[PDB]
Structures are given as structure tokens and as C-alpha cells.
Symmetry: C2
Subunit: 161 residues, 2 copies
């Protein structure tokens, strides 16, 4: 039994809690920041998308990102990060899935993120945030799964609900 | 029995031939272009690498690209693409491997590229080039594998030689 779903919102995501987001449409999914040197955001791209430029509102600004999805059946989350307040976002991670679920966690001064392609996704990607009070914003419904139950989260990522 | 290894060189890679490169050092691996609107390149990043800017020479220009490798035991190939002559390169694909083998092919107006994390890699990523005479350059040793033996190439990528 899963703790959720919660409505889109901004809050101080408690540490050691997986935030598992469930978007329905292509576009921005969620963003978060530590305030100093990490502005992260994940977007989702529908199947079968040729290399193209799309506008997204990240950190309150319209930025233009070139995106891709070479899968014909799976949606693709992309994890973008910018390292300065006025810098550009670059792609650092992605998640391929037909369940349209992704998840990140504030743990051990990092943000961990589920990688790869289902049903073989795992919490392999991370970035250092060094801020347990980092604020996260979700545009879509999400669930909270404690760190001790990471495996459960993994199963949800790879098999759906 | 694989055709190779071949010495580093530049040439018009014949269509329907997997070009499988095997570097030994971190840094640039190979480049290629269709000459008009697509310049691609693959670099390789050693294990255990934090977010940083590294220097590469791509299309004859020294550029800074943001790289990471969150694996403790595998090297990470990264596929960068530049979409206009005056533009920048951005990451669009990657391959996690402890065998330090990557491969791309010119087929069906496209370049296909081995994706994911071994031993589950496959030729999932592609970009359109629309030029069968696109020129390719490799800084490292490489092998040629016919398209009819794609799976053999796949096995190499996932299992070594």
C-alpha cells in the first residue's frame, strides 16, 4: 500500500523519502533546487519524437531544450540540471518506461534518481545537493515511499502500480 | 572472427557495417559528420567521476562539455551531437560498459548506436544523417562487423571479446 497520491505542490521534501511522480502528459514534470549550485528538473517526452526544440518553463524562465525519444512504445523522462542561477540546463540522466512513473530521493546529501530502461531500472544516478531543506515542486500527482522500502519503489518503477 | 582491429583513421564508413571502437584512455573516441547539419562524437569517461566540465576537440574546436559517471565499476561512453555548424554539442546518448567497447552503424538514412547498460545494451538510439557518404574518424582501434551479424556485435558490446 502506497502513501499517495498527493496533488501537485511545492514543499520541502523530507530526506530519505522517494518522491515518485506520475505524469499524464508530455512536458515538465517536476523541478527542485538547493539554492546555490543545483537546479534540477525532469521532463517527460512522448514516444517516437524526432530531434526537436521545445520550450519549457524552468526556474521561472522560458528555456529552449532540444529533446529526443527514439523509443516507439515508451515515454522518456529526462533529468536536466543547471549549475548556476543564470546558466543553461544540460541533460544528465533519463528513464525509459511505459508506466510513466519516475522517482527521486533526498538521501545522504544527494538526490538519487532511477536510471535506464524498465524493467531493469535502478537508483543508479545521483547529484550532490548538500541541502536537506532543498525545495521540490511537482506539476503532477506523486507518492512517497520511505528509504527502507526502496525496493518497493524499484518494483513500482519497473512494473507499474 | 571479427574484421579488425583497424588503426585510427578517417574514412567513408560503408553502409551496413557496424564500427565497433575500443579505446584505452578517457577522452575523445570518434567523430563523424554528414557535412551539413549533423556532427556527432562519442567520448568515454572513466568510473567514479563527479559533475565537471572537461575539454574536448570536436569538429576542430576546443569545447567544454559537462560529464559525470556515477558507476564505480564501468566506463561510460557518451554520444554528443551538434545540430548546426556554429552550435554546441549536447549529450543525447550513453553506454555503460566494463568492456570499453562501443559501436555505431550507418543504415537506412541514419546512424544507430548501442544504448544502455551491459549486459543489456542494444542498438536502440539513432539520429538521421541522410548522407550515405558521411565521413567518420576514429582515434582508437576499431572492428567492422556486417549488419547481418548485428547480434554478434551486440554480444561483443555486452560481453567483451
Amino acid at each position: 500500500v502506497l502513501d499517495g497520491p498527493y496533488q501537485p505542490t511545492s514543499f520541502n521534501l523530507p530526506v530519505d523519502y522517494w518522491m515518485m511522480m506520475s505524469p499524464t502528459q508530455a512536458g515538465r514534470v517536476a523541478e527542485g533546487t538547493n539554492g546555490t549550485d543545483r537546479w534540477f528538473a525532469c521532463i517527460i517526452v512522448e514516444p517516437n519524437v524526432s530531434l526537436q526544440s521545445r520550450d519549457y518553463v524552468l526556474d521561472g524562465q522560458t528555456v529552449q531544450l532540444q529533446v529526443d525519444n527514439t523509443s516507439n512504445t515508451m515515454w522518456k523522462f529526462i533529468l536536466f540540471i543547471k549549475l548556476t542561477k543564470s546558466g543553461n540546463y544540460s541533460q544528465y540522466s533519463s528513464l525509459l518506461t511505459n508506466h510513466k512513473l519516475c522517482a527521486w530521493i533526498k538521501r545522504d546529501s544527494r538526490v538519487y534518481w532511477f536510471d535506464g530502461t524498465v524493467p531493469n531500472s535502478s537508483d543508479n544516478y545521483y547529484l550532490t545537493i548538500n541541502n536537506d531543506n532543498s525545495i521540490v515542486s511537482s506539476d503532477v500527482d506523486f507518492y512517497l515511499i520511505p528509504r527502507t522500502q526502496t525496493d518497493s519503489c524499484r518494483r513500482c518503477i519497473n512494473n507499474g502500480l
